[PDB]
């Protein structure tokens, strides 16, 4: 295991004492394999076994409803009254709901694809090595590859480990490093040491990274690291070391879970404490085990009254219909709970290229030297029209079309852009528009050369297929490109060594053609081209050039600029060695500046507006970009991250500037920063940590395994649809169209969805408060059992379950994106809303109890004993207050219960309407604003008749409440809940909140 791309090929061999020709000996292999382990990432042990479910049952509010399932089964055996076989469905239904909420609850197929898993895809099964025990090329399990052993790689091979290149057997080695970046265009390798101990992967020109694959050639190298110690394995570990917090809702539901369990077993002691009657009253009779069955009866009644069963199903359905909706709008949300955290997003860090912009480069402006007289110099400047890749548009001067070949320097400008170029252009016959073949910046030039028709080639008589590369071809006819010196970040340029195709125009020797970032290229220009003449570089000249470059890059029209120059008399062909990449810069020396091109990658049509939408939503937007700081700040102005003229010093940092900052100062930079330029390997991940340190819900965009730890880390990882397999799985959302506005649009959707959830979560539990407050009263201060569990199970699944789902379809609030993001710790119910629900639960608690008790005092048709005082006695062993009459069964009658259910169903219908809004009256924000709710109100009441009339069903429940006088009291006991809430709903006029 070496730490060196920075060492000579000798040094690495000597490190492990291997011979390049023999490789590692069988003993070395053994020694090494023990020191370093196998070439593999650890196995993941959280697999698909039933552990899923036994966990699902491990929860409190599941265990509590399971203990009450066992109690229900023991009770469904010992029976009196009519000894009917139908009451066996009672302990059977809970078990079914405990299964249905488990199966659907344990839906970790959405989480079956975890990002660390996806990382095995890039370790191959096979690798080839040159051990000492065979002179041949043993092809072994990649697993058994050790650091120090001499490896072989050829075209098509996935690189088996992090390898220090030793010898390139083919004329050139190209590797595809997309898994890292996403940046398809393959890179050239070399053998020379990269002497900076802290070189980033991009710049490790002599290394092959495990999991990467070879595009062209054959090379022999020495394995340096394996297992978790390769680049890819280091990314694995960071991902393993980050743990996900639970979504702020999931957290509340657990907190509500715990606090419910507390209230449940705080009533059980109160019931016992209120029942110091049985402990002193019933002298004898064997009621010690016959009366302890009564507490077990109210137990299962207390549980189901509190547990808001089916809420799982409601929230799950609501979210599932959220995912479908978001997809139509190009936001693919991998994980269901995400649609909530999405709603809370307070910061978006977005890559510029292809997300904030279109990634469609076109050259707009270009200049060359006009005249250089002493200390004054003028330039010739030109615009170019049309932003597409079509060779369709014009060069113009002073806003008027001109002919580029009339300018000697434009000729050479075009020569360089066509020769110093690895791309080209292709007319897609099928779609009917042209196409880049390669890097976009490079194609922008090809298109340019196509528009400047310097040699005046006839084009209007040409096929739209030939047309594509017509003029470039003419320039290739003119100069034979021998070799080419690749780009490198170290010198920020690229040249091309060219010879004259023996046409004999400018037949004065070979020529290198240099194009690169303006600073470096210009610094290596001793000369300036002026038409065809050449004059020494001077301060005034260099000032003029740089002055305009600065204008174009930082001005309103934001142009990335390339300087182009040529080496008039390049070093001898033989005297150059093309293998020495650090030697490339000195070959590009004694240049003659020729011209500059300024190209644009336009801000996507919708960003300007979307960013404004974020301003209003109180969402920070942070641009991460490869632009130089100057242009970063400019582009930011252009798209409205910064005011057209505002102060921005401390607000935008280069990656280097960030690095110079002490930790604390770095942290403080992130709570303010809106633009990061030329950010490094670590940075995204650091940016996310700091943002989180200020309690910010963070959206972060990225691609590649490079960006996976950041996407894991961020509350919202965001991959591009065109992105790698791994970035995709690491993300919490995929953007199908790569557009920025899809994030912003997905945020609005999440705020919309959550708002209704708040309402339907609150409504559904609001019912349970009532049920408990009811069941308590019908146990302690009174005995006449008002509601039985079975009824409540059907109430909490269907009668409330439909309006609950309908609230899921509530009409989106009108000002969502004009209020700031929701606090994650903001509780759904406290303050005034607690007392509000504390009263509604209480009211209904006294309504269903009151309508069960009213059955005694008033009821005309059917049993009606005025002031019967069922609170007095329930056992019926005496029958002395009742002198002579067979009556002791009206106690467990299927009629006074049908009163309560009819009330409960009806109040929840009003409380469903009540729950359309939080604050606005139903006369301000009407019940007819939600057509699906009315549709549910109808269906809810309709199915209530069904289980009351069609006989099989009113057997497990009760008997029909025929009378209209009986249904009149139902409405007269239930409908005033609208009135109570309404008073409280708008007491907020006084309570100065809204
Ligand atoms: C299911 C029915 C009930 C009555 C249950 O106790 O819910 C309580 C409870 C656990 C909470 C309360 C209920 O508190 C009470 O009702 C007081 C007890 C009075 C009962 C009468 C005595 C016999 C919720 C339901 O209702 C009221 C009346 O305000 C609101 C909210 O719950 C939520 O917001 C859930 C969101 C995930 C929680 O106070 C919550 O505990 C929390 O941690 C919270 C903050 O969440
Ligand atoms: C409010 C609240 O926290 C909860 C809920 O409201 N539900 C779920 C739950 O925990 C429980 C649910 C999740 N997973 C399973 C598996 C099996 C059975 C259940 C569940 C029922 C639980 C219920 C209904 C209490």
Q: Which residues pair with 514 in a beta bridge?
A: 565
Helix (H) or strand (E) holding 253: helix 248-274
CA 578 to CA 484: how far, in whole Å? 9
Residue found under tokens 């298109």:
447
Q: Is 351 a catalytic residue?
A: yes
CA 906 to CA 978: how far, in whole Å? 11
Q: At what angle do helices 60-75 and 248-274 cross, to 10 degrees?
A: 40
Taking the CA atoms of 677, 678, 681 and 682 in sequence, report the sign of the dihedral they define: negative
CA 990 to CA 971: how far, in whole Å? 30
Q: Is any atom of ligand 2 closer than 6 Å to the C-beta of 56?
A: yes
10 Å CB burial of residue 692 (0-12, 13-18, 19+) is middle
Instruction: Provide the CB-side half-sphere exposure for 710 (13 A, CA).
Output: 29
**Token pair in block for residue 697:** 């819900």
Question: Please, are residues 744 and 728 in contact by the beta-carbon 8 Å criterion?
Answer: no
Opening angle at CA 57, ends 53 and 62, nearest 5: 145
**Token pair in block for residue 887:** 């009556």
Nearest alpha carbon to residue 9 among 161, 227, 205, 222:
222
**Ligand 2 centroid, distance to 305 Cα (angstroms):** 14
CA 767 to CA 761: how far, in whole Å? 10
Q: What is the DSSP string of 200-258?
A: -GGG-TTEE-TT-EEEE-EEEEEEEE-GGGSHHHHHHHHHHT--PPPPHHHHHHHHHHH
Nearest alpha carbon to residue 771 among 293, 272, 263, 270:
263
Residue found under tokens 């009451």:
87
10 Å CB burial of residue 500 (0-12, 13-18, 19+) is middle
| Pure H helices in 427-572 | 440-451, 470-476, 518-523, 539-554
CA 112 to CA 118: how far, in whole Å? 11
Q: Is any atom of ligand 2 closer than 6 Å to the C-beta of 621?
A: no
Catalytic residue selected from 149, 157, 351, 601:
351
- Examine the domain organization and report whether 638 and 774 are in the same domain: no
Question: Which domain-ending residue is among 240, 266, 297?
Answer: 240
CA 232 to CA 771: how far, in whole Å? 56
CA 481 to CA 786: how far, in whole Å? 94
Task: Find all residues with CB under 8 Å of 111, minimum gap 6, and list them.
Answer: 335
Question: Please, are residues 231 and 32 in contact by the beta-carbon 8 Å criterion?
Answer: no
**Ligand 1 centroid, distance to 305 Cα (angstroms):** 12
Rg of the chain's alpha carbons, rounded to an integer?
Answer: 39
Question: Please, are residues 732 and 259 in contact by the beta-carbon 8 Å criterion?
Answer: no
Query: Could you give the 3-state DSSP secondary structure of residue 363?
Result: strand
Nearest alpha carbon to residue 176 among 190, 155, 148, 198:
155
**Whole-angstrom distance between the N-terminal and C-terminal Cα of the chain?**
64
**Token pair in block for residue 553:** 């890059």
- Examine the domain organization and report whether 613 and 529 are in the same domain: no
Question: Please, are residues 427 and 435 in contact by the beta-carbon 8 Å criterion?
Answer: yes
Q: Which domain holds residue 587?
A: 359-602
- Examine the domain organization and report whether 812 and 875 are in the same domain: yes
**Ligand 2 centroid, distance to 142 Cα (angstroms):** 46
Residue 491 known to bind ligand: no
- Examine the domain organization and report whether 133 and 204 are in the same domain: yes
- Examine the domain organization and report whether 213 and 93 are in the same domain: no
Residue 39 DSSP symbol = S
- Examine the domain organization and report whether 707 and 661 are in the same domain: yes
- Examine the domain organization and report whether 667 and 542 are in the same domain: no
Q: Name which residue sits closest to atom 23 of ligand 1, judged by CA.
A: 773
CA 172 to CA 151: how far, in whole Å? 17
**Token pair in block for residue 762:** 């609150």
Instruction: Provide the CB-side half-sphere exposure for 113 (13 A, CA).
Output: 13
Phi, psi of 679 (to 5 degrees): -65, 150
| Pure H helices in 714-830 | 725-730, 740-777, 789-794, 801-807
- Examine the domain organization and report whether 723 and 766 are in the same domain: no
Question: Kind of pairing, strands 162-168 and 207-208?
Answer: antiparallel
Phi, psi of 218 (to 5 degrees): -140, 135
Phi, psi of 219 (to 5 degrees): -145, 150
- Examine the domain organization and report whether 772 and 866 are in the same domain: yes
Nearest alpha carbon to residue 692 among 346, 184, 302:
346
Question: Please, are residues 419 and 445 in contact by the beta-carbon 8 Å criterion?
Answer: no
Nearest alpha carbon to residue 265 among 493, 67, 518:
67
User: What's the farthest any 2 CA atoms get from each other in the chain?
Assistant: 134
Nearest alpha carbon to residue 76 among 296, 278, 268, 265:
296
**Token pair in block for residue 305:** 């009254």
**Token pair in block for residue 392:** 């369709």
CATH number at residue 990: 1.20.1110.10
**Ligand 2 centroid, distance to 103 Cα (angstroms):** 12
Task: Find all residues with CB under 8 Å of 55, minimum gap 6, and list them.
Answer: 106
Residue 963 DSSP symbol = -
CA 897 to CA 850: how far, in whole Å? 11
Give, in order, the Cα–Cα distances in Å from 88 to each of 507, 677, 947.
Answer: 103, 70, 18
**Token pair in block for residue 958:** 């009760």
Q: Which residues pair with 126 in a beta bridge?
A: 141
CA 374 to CA 544: how far, in whole Å? 13
CA 136 to CA 139: how far, in whole Å? 9
Residue found under tokens 């991250």:
641
Opening angle at CA 379, ends 376 and 382, nearest 5: 165
140 backbone φψ class: left, alpha, beta (φ>0; ψ -120 to 50): beta
- Examine the domain organization and report whether 544 and 617 are in the same domain: no
Question: Which domain-ending residue is among 738, 770, 790?
Answer: 738
CA 239 to CA 722: how far, in whole Å? 22
Counting every residue written for the chain, the total comes to 994
CATH number at residue 152: 2.70.150.10
Q: Name which residue sits closest to atom 21 of ligand 2, judged by CA.
A: 62
Nearest alpha carbon to residue 924 among 834, 859, 973, 994:
994
Question: Kind of pairing, strands 591-600 and 525-530?
Answer: parallel
Domain count for the chain, please give it: 4
**Ligand 2 centroid, distance to 61 Cα (angstroms):** 6
**Token pair in block for residue 957:** 């429940």
Experimental method, per PDB record: X-ray
What are the helix and strand counts (H, E) for the chain? 32, 30
Pocket of ligand 1 (CB under 6 A): 252-253, 255-256, 259-260, 263, 267, 306, 761, 765, 768-769, 772-773, 776, 827-829, 834, 837-838, 841
**Ligand 1 centroid, distance to 265 Cα (angstroms):** 14
Q: What is the DSSP string of 297-341?
A: HHHHHHHHHH--TTHHHHHHHHHHHHHHHHHHTTEE-SSTTHHHH
Q: Which residues pair with 363 in a beta bridge?
A: 599
Q: Is any atom of ligand 2 closer than 6 Å to the C-beta of 312?
A: yes
Nearest alpha carbon to residue 621 among 600, 605, 642, 603:
642
Report the residue among 62, 252, 315 best suited for mutation to probe ligand 2: largest number of ligand atoms under 8 A from its CB. 62
Q: Name which residue sits closest to atom 11 of ligand 2, judged by CA.
A: 62
CA 794 to CA 796: how far, in whole Å? 6
10 Å CB burial of residue 218 (0-12, 13-18, 19+) is middle
Give, in order, the Cα–Cα distances in Å from 866 to each of 63, 163, 963.
Answer: 43, 94, 19
Phi, psi of 318 (to 5 degrees): -50, -45
**Token pair in block for residue 781:** 């201060």
CA 437 to CA 469: how far, in whole Å? 11
Query: Could you give the 3-state DSSP secondary structure of residue 70?
Result: helix
Question: Please, are residues 427 and 434 in contact by the beta-carbon 8 Å criterion?
Answer: yes
Q: Which residues pair with 213 in a beta bridge?
A: 158, 176
CB atoms near residue 66 (< 10 Å):
16
Q: Is any atom of ligand 2 closer than 6 Å to the C-beta of 308?
A: yes
Phi, psi of 336 (to 5 degrees): -60, -45
**Token pair in block for residue 766:** 């609001």
Residue 271 known to bind ligand: no
Residue 732 DSSP symbol = S
Instruction: Provide the CB-side half-sphere exposure for 846 (13 A, CA).
Output: 7
CB atoms near residue 732 (< 10 Å):
23
Question: Please, are residues 625 and 677 in contact by the beta-carbon 8 Å criterion?
Answer: yes
Strand (E) positions, 145-190?
150-154, 162-168, 174-176, 187-188
Q: Name which residue sits closest to atom 17 of ligand 1, judged by CA.
A: 838
Taking the CA atoms of 41, 45, 46 and 49 in sequence, report the sign of the dihedral they define: positive
Question: Please, are residues 650 and 367 in contact by the beta-carbon 8 Å criterion?
Answer: no
Task: Find all residues with CB under 8 Å of 253, minimum gap 6, and list them.
Answer: none
Give, in order, the Cα–Cα distances in Å from 867 to each of 129, 253, 845, 871.
Answer: 97, 44, 20, 10
Nearest alpha carbon to residue 145 among 166, 163, 169, 122:
163
Q: At what angle do helices 90-103 and 60-75 cross, to 10 degrees?
A: 160
Instruction: Provide the CB-side half-sphere exposure for 508 (13 A, CA).
Output: 4
Residue found under tokens 């059955």:
855
Task: Find all residues with CB under 8 Å of 755, minimum gap 6, and list them.
Answer: 810, 812, 813, 816
CB atoms near residue 635 (< 10 Å):
25
Q: Cα 604 to chain center, whole Å? A: 21
Q: Which residues pair with 699 in a beta bridge?
A: 348, 716
Helix (H) or strand (E) holding 543: helix 539-554
**Token pair in block for residue 971:** 């409405």
Task: Find all residues with CB under 8 Å of 82, minimum gap 6, and list them.
Answer: none
Give, in order, the Cα–Cα distances in Å from 922 to each of 62, 829, 935, 985.
Answer: 37, 21, 17, 10
CA 352 to CA 624: how far, in whole Å? 6
Q: Is any atom of ligand 2 closer than 6 Å to the C-beta of 307?
A: yes
Task: Find all residues with CB under 8 Å of 490, minimum gap 6, and list them.
Answer: 203, 582, 585
Q: Is any atom of ligand 2 closer than 6 Å to the C-beta of 309?
A: yes
CB atoms near residue 789 (< 10 Å):
24
> % helix / strand / coil in the chain, to the nearest 5?
45, 15, 40
- Examine the domain organization and report whether 525 and 581 are in the same domain: yes
Question: Which domain-ending residue is among 602, 620, 636?
Answer: 602
- Examine the domain organization and report whether 429 and 567 are in the same domain: yes
CA 560 to CA 474: how far, in whole Å? 27
């Amino acid at each position: 295991m070496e730490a060196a791309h920075s060492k000579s090929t000798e040094e690495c061999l000597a490190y492990f004492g291997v011979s390049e020709t023999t490789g590692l000996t069988p003993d070395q292999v053994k020694r090494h394999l023990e020191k370093y382990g196998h070439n593999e990432l650890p196995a993941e042990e959280g697999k698909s076994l039933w552990e899923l479910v036994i966990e699902q049952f491990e929860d409190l509010l599941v265990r509590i409803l399971l203990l009450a399932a066992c109690i229900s089964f023991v009770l469904a055996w010992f029976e009196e009254g009519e000894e009917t076989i139908t009451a066996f469905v009672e302990p059977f239904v809970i078990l079914l709901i405990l299964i249905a909420n488990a199966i659907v609850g344990v839906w970790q197929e959405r989480n079956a694809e975890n990002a660390i898993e996806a990382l095995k895809e890039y370790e191959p099964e096979m690798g080839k090595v040159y051990r000492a025990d065979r002179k041949s090329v043993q092809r072994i399990k990649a697993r058994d590859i050790v650091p120090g052993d001499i490896v072989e790689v050829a075209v098509g091979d996935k690189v088996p480990a992090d390898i220090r290149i030793l010898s390139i057997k083919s004329t050139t080695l190209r590797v595809d490093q997309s898994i890292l970046t996403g940046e398809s265009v393959s890179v050239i390798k070399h053998t020379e040491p990269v002497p900076d101990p802290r070189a980033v992967n991009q710049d490790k020109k002599n290394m092959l990274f495990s999991g990467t694959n070879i595009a062209a050639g054959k090379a022999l190298g020495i394995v340096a690291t394996t297992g978790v110690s390769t680049e890819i394995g280091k990314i694995r570990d960071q991902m393993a070391a980050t743990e996900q917090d639970k979504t702020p809702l999931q957290q509340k539901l657990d907190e509500f879970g715990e606090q419910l369990s507390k209230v449940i077993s705080l009533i059980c002691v109160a019931v016992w404490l209120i029942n110091i009657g049985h402990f002193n009253d019933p002298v004898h009779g064997g009621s010690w085990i016959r009366g302890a069955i009564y507490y077990f009866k109210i137990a299962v009644a207390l549980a189901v009254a509190a547990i808001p069963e089916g809420l799982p199903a409601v929230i799950t359905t609501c979210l599932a219909l959220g995912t479908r909706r978001m997809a139509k709008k190009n936001a693919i949300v991998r994980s269901l709970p995400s649609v909530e955290t999405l709603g809370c997003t307070s910061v978006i860090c977005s890559d510029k290229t292809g997300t904030l912009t279109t990634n469609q480069m076109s050259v707009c402006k270009m200049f060359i030297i006009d005249k250089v007289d002493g200390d004054f110099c003028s330039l010739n400047e030109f615009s170019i029209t049309g932003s597409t890749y079509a060779p369709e548009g014009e060069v113009l001067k002073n806003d008027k079309p001109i002919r580029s070949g009339q300018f000697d320097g434009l000729v050479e400008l075009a020569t360089i852009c066509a020769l110093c170029n690895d791309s080209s252009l292709d007319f897609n016959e099928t779609k009917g528009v042209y196409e880049k073949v390669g890097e976009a910046t490079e194609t922008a030039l090809t298109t340019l050369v196509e528009k400047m028709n310097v040699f005046n080639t006839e084009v209007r008589n040409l096929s739209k297929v030939e047309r594509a590369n017509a003029c470039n071809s003419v320039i290739r006819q003119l100069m034979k490109k021998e070799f080419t010196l690749e780009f490198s970040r170290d010198r920020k340029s690229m040249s091309v060594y060219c010879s004259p195709a023996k046409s004999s125009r400018a037949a004065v020797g070979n020529k290198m053609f240099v194009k690169g970032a303006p600073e470096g290229v210009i610094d290596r220009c001793n000369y300036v081209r002026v038409g065809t003449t050449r004059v020494p570089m001077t301060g005034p000249v260099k000032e003029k050039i740089l002055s305009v470059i600065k204008e174009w890059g930082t001005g309103r029209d934001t142009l990335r600029c390339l300087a182009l120059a040529t080496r008039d008399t390049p070093p001898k062909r033989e005297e150059m060695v093309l293998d020495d990449s650090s030697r490339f810069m000195e070959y590009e020396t004694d240049l003659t500046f020729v011209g500059v091109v300024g190209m644009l990658d336009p801000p996507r049509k919708e960003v300007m507006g979307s960013i404004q939408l974020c301003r209003d939503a109180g969402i920070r937007v942070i641009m991460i970009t490869g632009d130089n700081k100057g242009t970063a700040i400019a582009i930011c102005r252009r798209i409205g991250i910064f005011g057209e003229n505002e102060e921005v010093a401390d607000r935008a940092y280069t990656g280097r500037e960030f690095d110079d900052l002490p930790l604390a100062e770095q942290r403080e930079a992130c709570r303010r920063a809106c633009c990061f330029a030329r950010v490094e390997p670590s940075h995204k991940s650091k940016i996310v940590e700091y943002l989180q340190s200020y309690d910010e819900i963070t959206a972060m965009t990225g691609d590649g395994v490079n960006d996976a730890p950041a996407l894991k880390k961020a509350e919202i990882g965001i991959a591009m649809g065109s992105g790698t397999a791994v970035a995709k799985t690491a993300s919490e959302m995929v953007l199908a169209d790569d557009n920025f506005s899809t994030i912003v649009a997905a945020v609005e959707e999440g705020r919309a969805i959550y708002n209704n959830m708040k309402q339907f979560i609150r409504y559904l539990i609001s019912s349970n408060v009532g049920e408990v407050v009811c069941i308590f009263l019908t146990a302690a201060l009174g005995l006449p059992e008002a509601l039985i569990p079975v009824q409540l199970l059907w109430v909490n699944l269907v009668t409330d379950g439909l309006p609950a789902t309908a609230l899921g379809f509530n009409p989106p609030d009108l000002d969502i994106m004009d209020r700031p993001p929701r606090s994650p710790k903001e509780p759904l119910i406290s303050g005034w809303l607690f007392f509000r629900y504390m009263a509604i639960g209480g009211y209904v608690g006294a309504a269903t109890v009151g309508a069960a008790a009213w059955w005694f005092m008033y009821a005309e048709d059917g049993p009606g004993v005025t002031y019967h005082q069922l609170t007095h006695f329930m056992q019926c062993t005496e029958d002395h207050p009742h002198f002579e009459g067979l009556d002791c069964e009206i106690f467990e009658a299927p009629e006074p219960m049908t009163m309560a259910l009819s009330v409960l169903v009806t109040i929840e219908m009003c409380n469903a309407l009540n729950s359309l809004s939080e604050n606005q009256s139903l006369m301000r924000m009407p019940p007819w604003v939600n057509i699906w709710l009315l549709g549910s109100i109808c269906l809810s009441m309709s199915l209530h008749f069904l289980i009351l009339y069609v006989d099989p069903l009113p057997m497990i429940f009760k008997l029909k409440a025929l009378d209209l006088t009986q249904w009149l009291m139902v409405l007269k006991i239930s409908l005033p809940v609208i009135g109570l809430d309404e008073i409280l709903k708008f007491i907020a006029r006084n309570y100065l909140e809204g």
